[PDB]
């Protein structure tokens, strides 16, 4: 019966391929062929933040466009003030192999995690006046790749054991678990309404999940190597993916098909971080050749280059009002561009 | 305005306190050496770690030689795939690679792992300290027969022992021949690439060796010496 199951799977894959071929009416380039080019985009460094001792692995903006969180492999978590470059807090971590960090929308809690397979939560508004550990979430069998906040009481986690999870912070238990990937999940991004979320794995695939029911609705393919960056379009009906084959792609959700690809001949190194802008017209992506590129999503022609970092770029971030772009690289420096 | 300055003064004093603490932390952080331990299940990498220790998933070890502190890590709470979490250890002083020499059918896997580590994009500037374990088992294997290394490697029949060898006081020539043949196999691929950016240090060890800490100390001293030669324009 196993051979029959394989034949049935192949036949249904053929039917799916025929359906996706039927859906593809016209190319994105043909529709976006007359719009004005963005032009030359030259940003300059406005603030340089120093104080970290080792390479920076992740960062996140607060929901005020003023406060920032940075994580480095030296084992420290620094909360800055971008306007005056004043360090607001410094937190020593128990484990120095930290791979992600997050900022709660309310602004009272901060989460972190890494190779220890544990998500740690710290409280910022303690009545005493000191940051302290509030709750540790455990249950993952692999390293944490990303973590995002839904409310003050719920969190979403993606691990290297090909699984994602939803946690209720108050009781510290898993409510739902999402499975189905073959390789390690590298990143995730929450929807604007916090009802769906997408995740890309090291099997050259991406999957869309519904938070409440806990099921996989759509899976997208097209890359030929590991996907190591993902985000969400401001509209909430598309997303962008970067892989190790040195090319970016844009995927939709109601068409269930790839839309656009960004590539160049001189680019051999892959992408590490991808972030959008407020309007949805600019795509910022950092590479391993020590700089970042600013692509125009609609035209798929490079419009800007950000240079100045002396090592591999690891993290990108954009404010909620689109007034600053923060880049963190392996040279222990955070740079703000406007 | 009064509130503005009344808050800026507090912000400045807090920043000064944090900066002082950060400098104090940097002083300690800059004087500690980090090492990453790699090997296979058959290889007794833990037992040497236990020996130096006596002398969450991630095993941690701290030891001290000549008032210099060394920190060793062991990642074992993950899956077989390791092409993503190994990029974290790119600023490590040196990688301690443990190899099983007694088993022949597992030697090709160790050679392939060593070759993959050698040619990595993010591991081209990190030296590797090679520990060939299980010398007694290899000696018992070759001496008693019933197992021919020629079957696994047909280049063992046209191999002659190099002259610049230092056999132990009491030892059969065949044992020395095979033992140095394994090291020659591992060192053949270590010299094809690498423009003097890293070097492989080979050593022979057993299950009762109590001298690995000094070996690592000397190798780290040589690595730091090379880095200082490059840094101080002495080349």
């Amino acid at each position, epitope marked *: 019966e196993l051979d029959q199951l394989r034949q049935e799977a192949e036949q249904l894959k053929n039917q799916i391929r025929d359906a996706r071929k039927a859906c593809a009416d016209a190319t994105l380039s043909q529709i976006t062929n007359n719009i004005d080019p963005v032009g030359r985009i030259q940003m300059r460094t406005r603030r340089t933040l120093r104080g970290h001792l080792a390479k920076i692995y992740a960062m996140h903006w607060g929901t005020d466009s003023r406060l920032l969180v940075s994580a480095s492999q030296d084992g420290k978590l620094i909360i800055w003030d971008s306007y005056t470059t004043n360090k607001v807090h410094a937190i020593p971590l128990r484990s120095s192999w930290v791979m992600t960090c997050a900022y709660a929308p309310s602004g009272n809690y901060v989460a972190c995690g890494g190779l220890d397979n544990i998500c740690s939560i710290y409280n910022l508004k303690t009545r005493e006046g000191n940051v302290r550990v509030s709750r540790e979430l455990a249950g993952h069998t692999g390293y944490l790749s990303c973590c995002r906040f839904l409310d003050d009481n719920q969190i979403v986690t993606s691990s290297g054991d090909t699984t994602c999870a939803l946690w209720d912070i108050e009781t510290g238990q898993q409510t739902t678990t999402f499975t189905g990937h*073959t*390789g390690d999940v590298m990143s995730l991004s929450l929807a604007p309404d916090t009802r769906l979320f997408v995740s890309g794995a*090291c*099997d*050259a695939s991406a999957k869309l999940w519904d938070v409440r029911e806990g099921m996989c609705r759509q899976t997208f*393919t*097209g890359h*030929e*190597s*590991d996907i190591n960056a993902i985000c969400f379009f401001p509209n909430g009906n598309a997303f962008a993916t970067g892989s*190790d*084959d*040195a090319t970016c792609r844009l995927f939709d959700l109601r068409a269930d098909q790839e839309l656009m690809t960004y590539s160049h001949d001189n680019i*051999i190194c*892959g992408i590490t971080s991808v972030s959008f802008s407020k309007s949805g017209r600019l795509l910022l992506a950092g590479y391993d050749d020590f700089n970042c590129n600013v692509w125009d999503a609609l035209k798929a022609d490079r419009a800007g280059v950000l240079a100045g970092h002396d090592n591999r770029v690891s993290c990108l971030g954009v404010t909620d009002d689109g007034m600053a772009v923060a880049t963190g690289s392996w040279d222990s420096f955070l740079k703000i561009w406007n | 305005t009064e509130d503005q300055r009344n808050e800026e003064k507090a912000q400045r004093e807090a920043n000064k306190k944090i900066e002082k603490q950060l400098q104090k932390d940097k002083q300690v952080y800059r004087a500690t050496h980090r090492l990453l331990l790699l090997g296979a299940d058959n290889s007794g990498k833990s037992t040497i770690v236990k020996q130096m220790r006596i002398l969450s998933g991630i095993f941690e070890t701290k030891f001290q030689v000549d008032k210099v502190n060394f920190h060793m890590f062991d990642v074992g709470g993950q899956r*077989d*795939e*390791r*092409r993503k979490w*190994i990029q974290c250890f790119n600023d490590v002083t040196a990688i301690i690679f443990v190899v099983d020499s007694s088993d022949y059918n597992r030697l*090709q*896997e160790a050679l*392939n792992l060593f*070759k*993959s*580590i*050698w*040619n*990595n*994009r993010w591991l081209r500037t990190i030296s590797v300290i090679l520990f060939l374990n299980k010398q007694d088992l290899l000696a018992e294997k070759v001496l008693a027969g019933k197992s021919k290394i020629e*079957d*696994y*490697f*047909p*280049e063992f029949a046209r191999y002659t022992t190099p002259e610049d060898a230092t056999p132990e006081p009491g030892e059969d020539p065949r044992v020395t021949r095979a033992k140095y043949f394994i090291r020659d196999e591992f060192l053949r691929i270590s010299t094809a*690439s690498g423009d003097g950016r890293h070097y492989c240090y080979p050593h022979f060890t057993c299950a009762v060796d109590t001298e690995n800490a000094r070996r690592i100390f000397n190798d780290c001293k040589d690595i730091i010496l090379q880095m200082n030669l490059r840094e101080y324009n002495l080349v």
Partner: nanobody
Amino acid sequence: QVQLQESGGGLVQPGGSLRLSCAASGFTFSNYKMNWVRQAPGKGLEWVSDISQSGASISYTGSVKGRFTISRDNAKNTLYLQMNSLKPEDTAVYYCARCPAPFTRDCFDVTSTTYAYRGQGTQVTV
């Protein structure tokens, strides 16, 4: 979608010959190093041979050093394994394996319990 499909196989006797062909689809064929692996009953996966992007560098294991031959064809995106003088230690499932990253001289995971880019395999018996 990445696809690597084996072919060939059959029943032979000690001292026979049979060529194995792997077809590929879904990626550029010349940027990736390729390997041959086999899995025989009672043990785990093992490595056999590898070939580079162009066709110059070639490596075997000792147990098959003087017997088998590898080849690759970029025009037809095919991987060939010539196999002769068989001995009762070759019955296994044969997977052709891709290197995860392009334009690199090394890659880590080719022989793992679960690997993304592999083939179903073919069974050959002596």
